[PDB]
Design a protein around this ligand. Structure first.
Ligand SMILES: O=C(O)C(O)(c1ccccc1)c1ccccc1
Ligand SMILES: O=C(O)C(O)(c1ccccc1)c1ccccc1
Lengths: 166, 166
């Protein structure tokens, strides 16, 4: 009864507050695809995908745009949409980029469904909101920068940090 | 035969490449008295004093200026000048600021004596120049800054560092 009426995507390369240092060098931006799922209820679901490397970014955006044809005019019923996408991609391989694109749809559909019911997603799933302990994630930073980032995270109130080693 | 013919002093508060962090706060400048010891040979000996706190700076400069009267026109013979200053200040107390001022004179007189003989001080003292291992001195810096300063010192080629604790 609530139907999906549109899918818009936007590919962006966005600045990171913490540049990610790697064995190769430092990456300052993240490739994302921002998703807007329009509905017959007027509300729009929002989600996004992380493409990991700019090499995959346009391909992932293109895939989602082409997958729009499968979902526009279907009811906003994420579980049912997921089953349909799983079946449609059973030959191509329901994994990798295809699976990630299907997940972006699913996340936007549940955000829309929360909006249809004017309730936070956690409550729609049947649970109460509760605070959840968070760790601050850093990178392959070496001694100087790992110490600096760890001090900042502790000052912010985090009780754990993650560093990349190797 | 070479005589001291003048003493000039200059009080300065100079910027430190490494601000000194203390339990109280950070000190960005050092109080110095710069010394010029003029001679009948034309060469000028240079030395300086560290006054430790700006509270002592003008007093130390004033003391040296008044001590000029004891040394101008005396032969440039640091060992003999030292004996004379030790005797003249035997009642006042040949220690503390008085002793530091006498040392500034002595250091400038030996620099002048090196110049009279056109030879590096080390050779005048009868030794060969040799490289001497140096450690880089830091302060009460905490974890972030001590790590940062230690990395820099190692990159510069130092094989040791000193940190302030307490
Ligand atoms: O666990 C992570 O967040 C991640 O594996 C990662 C992987 C891929 C994208 C974003 C985060 C990681 C974190 C810190 C250092 C290296 C890797
Ligand atoms: O040994 C030093 O250089 C000194 O004692 C000092 C004392 C007074 C003036 C300059 C240096 C020190 C160094 C690092 C931290 C605290 C103290």
């Amino acid at each position: 009864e609530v139907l999906i009426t549109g899918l818009r995507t936007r590919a962006v390369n966005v600045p990171l507050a913490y540049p990610v240092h790697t064995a190769v060098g430092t990456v300052g931006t993240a490739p994302l695809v921002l998703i807007d799922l329009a509905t017959s209820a007027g509300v729009v679901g929002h989600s996004y995908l992380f493409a990991y490397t700019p090499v995959a970014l346009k391909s992932l955006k293109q895939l989602l745009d082409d997958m729009a044809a499968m979902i526009v005019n279907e009811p906003l019923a994420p579980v049912s949409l997921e089953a349909m996408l799983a079946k449609r991609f059973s030959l191509a391989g329901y994994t990798g980029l295809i699976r990630m694109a299907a997940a972006g749809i699913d996340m936007a559909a549940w955000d829309a469904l929360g909006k249809v019911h004017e309730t936070p997603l956690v409550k729609l799933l049947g649970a109460n909101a509760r605070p959840v302990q968070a760790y601050d994630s850093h990178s392959l930073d070496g001694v100087k920068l790992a110490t600096e980032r760890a001090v900042t995270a502790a000052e912010l109130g985090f009780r754990a940090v993650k560093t990349c080693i190797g």
